[PDB]
């Protein structure tokens, strides 16, 4: 099981990805601490919220390690309820427009079914699944382009909802297309050796979907971008 070479580099990625926010925290804190003289209230509060925002980035990354463990232990549950999918995706869209702008990305929610859409799934874990593909959409995109978006399309299909996450971004090679959903996998290219990435997002997403008795799959070529399909039955069984 080459899983032992991969977890070895997954180790250095946990390293790099956690120390970016930790670098902000230390630098800002030491600065406040050493520069109360030369800070005005408005900057102080600003530096303080830098510390707070970077903490929350770091908390999310830790939550990912947690989730994953709870999954690779077959030990995590869903608690389904009647959710208006249309709000849940938009509540989700609203929850990215920060990251979105930091990379000059427009965020789009389109509807192909009428929008009071009802659902019987867990809003928390699906909101999480959304945020996972949304993020990757922003995080993976054209390094220089004005056109760039991330598009969430709701739909019903085969007595079951079909959410798609379209990007116009950077896209994926064929040999990797099936292996992007595994534990620890990261598409290494000279193009994107830069991305913080854990290599667990999609592994956590597949798992979460396949527990709602649904599926996730992908279409993409190396120029146009990528499509993510999450098929999820209206009410499972």
């Amino acid at each position: 099981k080459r899983i032992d070479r991969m977890k070895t580099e997954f180790i250095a990625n946990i390293s790099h990805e956690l120390r970016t926010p930790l670098t902000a925290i230390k630098a800002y804190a030491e600065t406040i601490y050493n520069s109360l003289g030369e800070l005005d209230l408005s900057t102080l509060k600003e530096f303080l919220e830098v510390i707070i925002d970077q903490s929350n980035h770091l908390e999310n990354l830790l939550n990912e390690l947690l989730d994953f463990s709870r999954l690779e232990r077959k030990s995590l549950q869903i608690n389904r309820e009647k959710v208006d999918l249309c709000d849940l995706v938009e509540s989700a869209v609203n929850a990215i427009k920060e990251f979105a702008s930091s990379h000059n990305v427009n965020v789009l929610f389109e509807s192909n079914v009428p929008c009071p859409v009802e659902a019987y799934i867990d809003p928390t874990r699906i909101r999480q699944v959304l945020l996972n593909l949304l993020n990757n959409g922003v995080k993976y995109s054209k390094k220089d382009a004005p056109d760039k978006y991330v598009k969430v399309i709701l739909d019903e299909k085969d007595g079951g909802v079909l959410i798609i996450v379209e990007d116009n971004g950077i896209g994926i090679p064929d040999h990797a297309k099936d292996r992007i959903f595994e534990q620890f996998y990261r598409v290494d290219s000279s193009l994107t050796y830069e991305v913080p990435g854990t290599g667990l997002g999609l592994a956590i997403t597949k798992e979460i979907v396949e527990l709602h008795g649904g599926r996730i799959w992908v279409e993409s070529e190396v120029g146009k971008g990528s499509r993510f399909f999450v098929w999820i039955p209206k009410d499972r069984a």
Binding site: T20, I25, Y28, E30, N34, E38, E194
Partner: protein, 122 residues
Amino acid sequence: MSKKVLLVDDSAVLRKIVSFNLKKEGYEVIEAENGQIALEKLSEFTPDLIVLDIMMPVMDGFTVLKKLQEKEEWKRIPVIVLTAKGGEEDESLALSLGARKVMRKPFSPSQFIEEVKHLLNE
């Protein structure tokens, strides 16, 4: 007051805090969101010190240091590299690639300035 500093980092949050500490000592600073911008901003003037990080999208820190150390005016302008890659090989790949000081991230702003001072006062 006097000495300039070109500060190159794909990180806004990081640029802000490095900048804040620089100007607190008088220096003025010119930001460069990436490698391309870095050099474009550079054909225009000559910084007395450069602060460069490594991992960035359009063009990376490694290439930047390279073009520096293969040009007469640029060869001589000292560079502090600020990287998250501690791997002490990365450090050699940096010094041999022109750098005049490597500084690990996370870093102490006070130390960092303490370094930025010495390099302006050789």
